[PDB]
Amino acid sequence: VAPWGRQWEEARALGRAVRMLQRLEEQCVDPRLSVSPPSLRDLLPRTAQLLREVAHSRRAAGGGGPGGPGGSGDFLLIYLANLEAKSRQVAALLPPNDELFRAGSRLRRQLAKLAIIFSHMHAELHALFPGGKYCGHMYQLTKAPAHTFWRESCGARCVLPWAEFESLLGTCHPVEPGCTALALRTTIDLTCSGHVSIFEFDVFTRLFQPWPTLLKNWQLLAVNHPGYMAFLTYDEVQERLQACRDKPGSYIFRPSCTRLGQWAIGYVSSDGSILQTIPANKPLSQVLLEGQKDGFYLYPDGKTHNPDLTEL
């Protein structure tokens, strides 16, 4: 059943993935590294177990629903190829005690980004295959307009190549070609696979609500805002805000890695301490404007001028 070519090759790819994550977990013995999410030391066994559940489920089912691009088999082919490529990059960073960082550092930034991507891959798989059971054809996006767009444009498909997704999105929210399209791909493609899944679109539309001005929100909140930090961990935000400890009201924001679709705002309190706040269901600009009115969110990344969020 397409896109797989031979009978049992999806099963074999799943077995490969599990064994690869087992080895990769063996390479994470260093008691440094951290436990602060996202941590490979816990994500890797969780993701391996999820893949074991997927494998058992699709063996019993033999294996998926209708074949073709955008269904569960296609999703798994791309997902497992991506998982393998990212695992290879991680394995190249880790030892045969690991390399000392002590970051700062280019290398601990790379490793942190890979950890984030592993957190995103885990969440995507968990969202689309709860208990190992594919639900992409029934998946409900949180924002109703976004749900309606995805089902009218993409149908039952749970994943699309960037090019087709961009064409479909652009019938509704036009995407300026070139650098802007590439910045949008980078924001939306949480797993860094060059494909957009229904889960990634769910997260993007929750983060950059409200729907009618979606890409405007993204431009004002991500592209044009110096407080926005892409692919940053909790620990990295802490390290970054240390340098603004003497400037209460310094703040940065980032998509949470643990509560996907929600924001995490780190800021310097009037005590010089670093606090994190995760807003409710309000759009981000409302939380930021109220925090500016209240004195908490005055200096994005410690800079003097706070962008005006009234004007779209």
User: CB of 83 within 8 A of CB of 13?
Assistant: no
* Closest CB to ligand A1CA8 among residues 70, 300: 70
DSSP string, 224-242: S-TTB-TT--HHHHHHHHH
* Part of the chain binding ligand A1CA8 (CB under 6 A), chosen from 26-34, 69-77, 182-190, 199-207: 69-77
Q: Tell whether 99 is in a known binding site.
A: no
Q: Tell whether 200 is in a known binding site.
A: yes
Residues paired with residue 276 on neighbouring β-strands, in sequence order = 266
Q: Output the six-digit token pair for 252.
A: 């940065």
| 3 contacts ligand A1CA8 (rule: CB under 6 A) | no
For residue 57, the minimal CB distance to ligand A1CA8 (Å) is 11
Helix (H, G, I), strand (E, B) or coil at 92: helix
Distance CA 154, CA 160 (A): 8
| 295 contacts ligand A1CA8 (rule: CB under 6 A) | no
Distance CA 46, CA 149 (A): 32
What single letter denotes the amino acid at residue 171?
T
What single letter denotes the amino acid at residue 149?
F
* Closest CB to ligand A1CA8 among residues 68, 272: 68
* Part of the chain binding ligand A1CA8 (CB under 6 A), chosen from 67-75, 139-147, 244-252, 303-311: 67-75
Q: Output the six-digit token pair for 268.
A: 């310097």
* Closest CB to ligand A1CA8 among residues 33, 156: 156
* Closest CB to ligand A1CA8 among residues 11, 103: 11
Quick one: 124 exposed, middle or buried, by C-beta within 10 A (0-12, 13-18, 19+)?
Answer: buried
Q: Tell whether 189 is in a known binding site.
A: yes
Q: Output the six-digit token pair for 296.
A: 């908490």
Which residue is it, tokens 């930021």? 288
* Part of the chain binding ligand A1CA8 (CB under 6 A), chosen from 5-13, 37-45, 61-69, 119-127: 61-69
Helix and strand numbers, DSSP H then E, in the chain: 11, 6
* Part of the chain binding ligand A1CA8 (CB under 6 A), chosen from 28-36, 44-52, 65-73, 227-235: 65-73
| 205 contacts ligand A1CA8 (rule: CB under 6 A) | no
Q: Tell whether 23 is in a known binding site.
A: no
Looking at residues 109 to 148 of the shown chain, list those that interact with ligand A1CA8 (rule: CB under 6 A): 134, 137
Which residue among 120, 122, 143, 157 contacts ligand A1CA8 (CB under 6 A)?
Answer: 157
Q: Output the six-digit token pair for 222.
A: 């991500």
Helix (H, G, I), strand (E, B) or coil at 44: helix
Give ∠ CA 263-129-145 in degrees, rounded to 5: 50
What single letter denotes the amino acid at residue 56?
H
* Part of the chain binding ligand A1CA8 (CB under 6 A), chosen from 38-46, 66-74, 196-204, 277-285: 66-74
| 64 contacts ligand A1CA8 (rule: CB under 6 A) | yes
Which residues contribute to the annotated binding site? 189, 191, 200, 254
Which residues contribute to the annotated binding site for 4-O-phospho-L-tyrosine? 254
Binding site for ligand A1CA8 (CB under 6 A): 64-66, 68, 70-72, 134, 137, 156-157
Which residues contribute to the annotated binding site for Ca(2+)? 189, 191, 200
